[PDB]
Symmetry: C3
Subunit: 493 residues, 3 copies
């Protein structure tokens, strides 16, 4: 009864779908670092040099491409020197944005950078422009990357790291329109131009610089930043949260009806319009697309769970959140020439997390499983997938009934992702494949019995992928019986 | 010499109570300047000048007696170059700095954060802290606020504790830059608004107290400054500062504080009255962006500025304080109280030994100025209720200058009594003032008068009460009328039963 | 065949030709400081307290009027505190612009300032605006100049200097349009206004403040800086390099034909148009001419010599460079009412140097000899000299065949400088002198047998001044037989 037709053009390959679209984001916020990543060398939670083993293994298994640290709003007040040297001598600071709680600085530059090397991931460092003078980020970059025998390099060596680390991405201010200094873009562009000057790449590696970009539909911000500074940036950040009910976040993460379901998906899909319009502005100043659009905060933002400190942003992660992730990956992959990095907010225990921990307990969220399903998209080639779908309507809201994307992976196999956004109606999908003879199709499905299903320590697999039985090939057509509220990932052979 | 007596008629509407006249209109201002801090307030624990923890006792008692509501510190121009860490920790380890604006003399930093904040607690007054925006990065004021107010066991809070203060202090007002159009960085307002927006971001209130933020506002009639600061930043400020000095003869200040004729008298009063026009016009601009009046207009520098006294360091701004200065203060209090919905803070420049001071000291000697006595007379205005007082007054004219012959204001005080202030601006003519009182049955009136035999009279160590308030016998009640025989060059404060 | 007629008006004296037009510029760059000036107390190169003796003597002999230090691009990242205190405790920094090499900071504030006193020259200090807060330059000025017992003054005393030094000129940012923070002028004007506020003169001496001005023909920069900030500056800097072939610098400093000769002189003469047009803008906002135009970078910029580190800007210095210097001195002296300071880039071993060193070897360049010839111009009086000259043409380029200038010196004598720009043709110059009875004339000539002649350690006097015998007086006329490619300086009795 819901019928979806489409075309896959394997013969019209497009741009690389960057692995950096699967970036993570670990702010010093709530238990995102302390408990979520760092437990300390003396913890009875099994750990490697203080990093909990369960989280390390889980993040390695989805091949995290980069982690942005330490913020976020925290980064615009962070002083990197507070986080180096003997732990006993590091100052206790106040985390002003996120509960006004004490920050021990036990997890600092060496602990984060060595964590990235343990995962085999890239570091995306967020520098302080709002409350520091430019010399702070200049010295931080030298400390981390200098191969010479300068005082800062020698101080890194004294602190136990002989060789430079790689710092491939460096954010030059975070949310400058808000928590980073309430700046008009005219002022922020001047500040960016100045502060970026003093972050210099040594001969031995290139540090790419990400300029502070718009929130939501702030097109004026993009216009000015690009007009004034496009020659001085390697990327421009944009931020868009999916916030059912609007700001401030009051929607339940655990308990919701179909109206809240469709509203959430409707809001998340706005990402496509935002990327389109911000990209078009970037094209006016940067037609060769040298500057990446960097979506370095996205995801859902709900009411805090009952009983939790609201400054710690703890929320559950349901099937709804899985669909949010699949729809955003689809959208990013459709804009792959310009959108070359993204970072979901946030990695562990905060906002739309991969993982929830509580002492030695750990659970993988439905969102984690979507990152796992879409692993073949990492550094794949975009393929055009054009779907002819009816709308799913509930009350005064409508969204596409089915959404999807496709790639040719580095192993040479074609993958098709499909999502059925309808809370109760299945769909029959028929995709005509051009440019590749088919014999077979294998797949996995992520769904659950109810839209509001989430994983817990006691029921860790309520939402988890299983083998999918509803895909078949006939002639040049892939036919899919796609259940309500589900995501499938199909591999053609 | 002689001038004929004048008639003034007026109406007092006790039945039309208006806005609260904030006690913060009586704010003081103690910059690190000349002997305003060193000698004027701080003598050190080992001084032979009688002192409590290094604060001279005589000044403490005098300031307590006028119920100082807040003190702004440490500037002024000094604040835009001050580094708060220079003023904390063991005194011998604090650096000696240079007071660049005010004589280029050494600043010992012996009077720093702890000494000022503990002084405010000794007086029972509020701290109005002036933060450095001009020559510091924003992290300095951010850390300063944490040091002073954090209740947690952060390193900065523990440093405050190490330096002898366990509990946080209260920091109810925080200035985010001082005179940014001038000594704070010669900024165009368009740039200052961006800088203010940025620096204010990082001054955060802990959960335990609210720190109000005062934005750097206009000098004199710089309406463009108010327009841009309000247009660009009104949502980020609790107050906007304005500055207006009374400078007879204009800048640079060359008029004598001790010796003057009637032309200089009326010129000074004419110039001081311009405050009303400035407040009116700056308020109207603020109304366009902030019609609910959430942002206070903060007059945080006002008062007279004269030539320095002969033989003094001109960078120390030492001037005498005469009957003329008393009238300047009474006229300004009248004006502020007429604008009480918007003007909710003011700070006279400056508290001890500097500009229009409350107190002058010289070693163990201390004298209370005529201006001090006006703060004392107007104490009942603190947190009082404004009452409309309309006066129909002739002009006082001398040469090509004219001012109202009589000026005044009224309140209903928290003690429940109605008070009426009247000032006769005429250097030689007495006035008969007849006030029709509505909404209050009249039984009795008493009062005090501040005057002197000559306009150019001031207080000295040798003649400490040449200008000082005494019982006033020239008010009478009849029916619904208060009749006042108001001498030339005088201020009266009347209390109705 | 080439005949030039002129008129000298000794009876119409003009403005003072400031000695500061002969300023030098010593950036921390290559071997300009380390090797070129500072060898260290432990060096076998003969030295006085670490300053090499040969360079000290040579610079004293041309009466250097001021030296600008320490940059240049280096100055916008320099932290003065790194260069004071016990040498063992000073941090090693990175010279990011000029090879990414280590900077020991052994040559710091005391070493530079005591060097200026040894030479009897003035210090022109270049302050950090780009990457520092304003408190740094404020404290630096106090450290150097405070006569009080402030902590900064006491620290100078502890470091071995009891009395203040004189700091007569202070640059408030360097190249803010580029290496100093990539600032548009509207932002730079706001930054200058703010930072200059906090550089204060003590009662005991006046510190003049130089505002960051235009590169080349950036008239918009001059317009905005003067419109917004002329009341806060004692001088406005301008920069103009003579770069044959254009940016990036690829022309040989050693080997060139007549086309490259005339192209270089044509490019250097553009200085006159730039000064004219920048001066006219300054006149609109500063009609009294209170603000000096300060040419604090000029000179030739060539390809780096073979085998050298390209970040050290090492080039040779030929007869062509001598004529560049004489033409620039002529031009500056014609604009002496407004142009009151200039600094050639750079003093030793860098760009159009006075001196080249290599270990204990030292050579004086052709450019040095032009500074020597023009010594009588120091604090002289400008005299109007009108020359009617044919053009020198080679291919599609033309320049005046002869160029010159004249002064009445403080020694009471009139001096006339003439340059023959032609690579091969001599000129006959006839100057009618008004307002001075003529008795005799003598002079010196700087030339060489070939245009591409330069000085080396093996041939240190290939280009050096000798007595000139080709001037004679007849009636009221000075007649000069002026050789091809030559500079003469004539002294009238």
């Amino acid at each position: 009864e819901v019928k979806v037709n489409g075309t896959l053009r394997v013969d019209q390959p497009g741009a690389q779908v960057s692995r950096q679209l699967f970036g993570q984001f670990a702010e010093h916020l709530g238990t995102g670092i302390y408990g979520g990543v760092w437990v300390g060398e003396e913890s009875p939670i099994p750990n490697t040099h203080g990093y909990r083993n369960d989280v390390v293994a889980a993040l390695k298994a989805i091949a995290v491409p980069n982690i942005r640290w330490p913020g976020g709003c925290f980064a615009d007040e962070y002083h990197w020197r507070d986080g180096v040297g003997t732990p006993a001598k590091r100052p206790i600071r106040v985390n002003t944005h996120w509960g006004g709680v004490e920050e021990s600085n036990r997890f600092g530059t060496h602990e984060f950078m060595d964590f990235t090397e343990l995962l085999g991931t890239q570091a995306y460092i967020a520098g302080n422009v709002g409350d520091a003078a430019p010399e702070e980020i200049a010295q931080w970059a030298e400390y981390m990357t200098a191969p010479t025998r300068s005082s800062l390099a020698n101080e890194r060596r004294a602190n136990g790291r002989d060789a430079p680390w790689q710092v491939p991405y460096f954010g030059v201010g975070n949310e400058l329109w808000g928590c980073g200094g309430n700046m008009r873009v005219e002022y922020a562009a001047d500040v960016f131009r100045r502060y970026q000057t003093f972050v210099k790449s040594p001969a031995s590696q290139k540090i790419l610089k990400i300029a502070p970009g718009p929130s939501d539909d702030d097109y004026h911000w993009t216009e000015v930043m690009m007009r004034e500074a496009s020659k001085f940036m390697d990327g421009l950040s944009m931020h868009y949260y999916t916030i059912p009910g609007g700001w401030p976040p009051r929607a339940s993460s655990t308990t919701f009806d179909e109206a809240a379901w469709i509203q959430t998906l409707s809001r998340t899909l706005v990402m496509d319009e935002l990327i389109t319009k911000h990209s078009a502005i970037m094209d006016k100043y940067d037609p060769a697309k040298k500057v990446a659009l960097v979506v370095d905060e996205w995801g859902t933002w709900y009411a805090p769970l009952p009983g939790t400190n609201p400054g710690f942003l703890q929320q559950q992660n349901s099937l709804r959140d899985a669909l949010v992730a699949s729809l955003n990956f689809d959208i990013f992959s459709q804009h792959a020439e310009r959108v070359r990095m993204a970072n979901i907010a946030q990695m562990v225990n905060v906002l739309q997390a991969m993982i929830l921990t509580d002492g030695d307990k750990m659970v993988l969220t439905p969102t984690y499983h979507v990152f796992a399903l879409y692993k073949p998209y990492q550094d794949a080639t975009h393929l055009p997938l054009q779907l002819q779908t009816p709308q799913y309507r509930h009350g005064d809201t409508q969204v596409p009934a089915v959404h999807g994307s496709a790639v040719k992976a580095k192993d040479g196999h074609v993958y098709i992702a499909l999502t059925n956004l309808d809370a109760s109606a299945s769909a029959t999908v028929s995709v005509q494949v051009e440019g590749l003879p088919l014999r077979a199709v294998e797949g996995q499905i992520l769904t659950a019995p109810a839209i509001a299903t989430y994983n817990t320590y006691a029921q860790p697999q309520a939402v988890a992928p299983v083998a999918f039985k509803g895909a078949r090939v006939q002639g040049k057509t892939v036919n899919v019986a796609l259940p309500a509220h589900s995501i499938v990932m199909l591999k053609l052979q």
